[PDB]
Amino acid sequence: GVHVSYDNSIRDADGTLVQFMYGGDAIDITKESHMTQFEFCLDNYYALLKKYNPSALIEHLDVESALKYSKKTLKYRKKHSKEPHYKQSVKYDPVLAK
């Protein structure tokens, strides 16, 4: 019964929770292959983008809010970067948790 709900959490059938995200990032094990093949990516760009087609999801998705936070966490990451894992600045949680 373990599955991914509609809230991105990983619960059993009885509601009991096991994880708060799949791989801790919630990525499909198959849509992965070329998720980081940046090379073979900027190659065919125009083909890739044709497939995904931004112009559609425009009015649907938030294009900002998230990004704004992806720069705050990066800043405060390189700030408390060096220090050990128990001195971390819990001041900024990942972008995925919010």
Partner 1 sequence: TTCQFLTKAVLDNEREQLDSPSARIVVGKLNNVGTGSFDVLAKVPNAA
Partner 2 sequence: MDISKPVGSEITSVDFGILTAKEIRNLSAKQITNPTVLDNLGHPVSGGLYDLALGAFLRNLCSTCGLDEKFCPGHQGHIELPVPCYNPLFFNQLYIYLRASCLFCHHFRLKSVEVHRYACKLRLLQYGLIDESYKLDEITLGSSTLLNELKSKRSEYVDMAIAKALSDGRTTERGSFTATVNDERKKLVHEFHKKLLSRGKCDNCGMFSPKFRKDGFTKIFETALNEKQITNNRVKSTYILSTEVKNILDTVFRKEQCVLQYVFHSRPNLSRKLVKADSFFMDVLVVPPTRFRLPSKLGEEVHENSQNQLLSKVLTTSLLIRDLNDDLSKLQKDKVSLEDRRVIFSRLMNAFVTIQNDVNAFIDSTKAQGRTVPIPGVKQALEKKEGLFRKHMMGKRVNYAARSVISPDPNIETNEIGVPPVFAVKLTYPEPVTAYNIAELRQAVINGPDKWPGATQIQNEDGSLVSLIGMSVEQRKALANQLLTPSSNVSTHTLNKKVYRHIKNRDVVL
Partner 3 sequence: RSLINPGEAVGIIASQSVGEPSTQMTLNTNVTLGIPRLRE
Q: Which stretch binds partner 3 (CB under 8 A): 29-37, 62-70, 81-89, 90-98?
A: 29-37
Contact with partner 2 (CB under 8 A) among 1, 6, 7, 15 = 15
What is d(CA 4, CA 6) in angstroms, rounded to the nearest whole number? 7
By beta-carbon proximity to partner 2, the closer residue of 16 and 36 is 16
Count of residues that interact with partner 1, criterion CB under 8 A: 7
Beta carbons within 8 Å of 80's beta carbon, 6+ residues apart = 87, 88, 89, 91
CA 59 from centre of chain: 20
Whether the CB-CB separation of 91 and 73 falls below 8 Å is answered with: no
Contact with partner 1 (CB under 8 A) among 7, 10, 14, 95 = 14
Q: Which stretch binds partner 3 (CB under 8 A): 21-29, 63-71, 73-81, 83-91?
A: 21-29
Residue type, 46: Y
